[PDB]
């Protein structure tokens, strides 16, 4: 699958968005996305270092802040040993 149709597949679906700084990650029901990778997120909850730091609401993430994005289909955030 191509990355752009993968992104519209992730549209209206729960995603795990991990940033490039401080091991920040987000649980988030994605709403929509544009052609230059700016994530419109809802039900945003934030983890630092795989610990619970808390829910924020509905946010917007820029291109330049993201390390990677995956789907949230049964994926756990405990650090695997």
């Amino acid at each position: 699958v191509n990355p752009r149709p993968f992104l519209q597949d992730l549209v209206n679906q729960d995603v795990i968005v991990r940033l490039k700084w401080g091991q920040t990650e987000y649980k988030g029901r994605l709403v929509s996305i544009d052609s230059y990778m700016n994530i419109q997120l809802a039900n945003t909850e934030e983890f630092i270092n795989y610990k619970s730091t808390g829910h924020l609401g509905q946010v917007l993430i820029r291109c330049n802040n993201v390390l990677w994005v995956t789907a949230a289909a049964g994926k756990q955030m405990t650090p695997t040993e």
Binding site: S32, D34, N38, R62
Partner: protein, 86 residues
Amino acid sequence: ANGPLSLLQTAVRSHTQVLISVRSGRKLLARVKAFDRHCNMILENVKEMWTETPVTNGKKGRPVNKDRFISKMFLRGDSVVIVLLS
């Protein structure tokens, strides 16, 4: 016009506050006036706070949530970590 542009335009229309974490490790609470295709931000009633550790006489002290108030503010799109429409 169906995504981040919609959120920024909704913030512009509703004149509601946003909480912005930015790449200097800083936190911002301010209202929304205008935005562009680069998502550069123009701000009002801005409350800026940050974490500063004062180095008292060579020893690491407890952190300070140091904050200031700025009346009018302009922000650049590439300096953002996260914006939350509160």
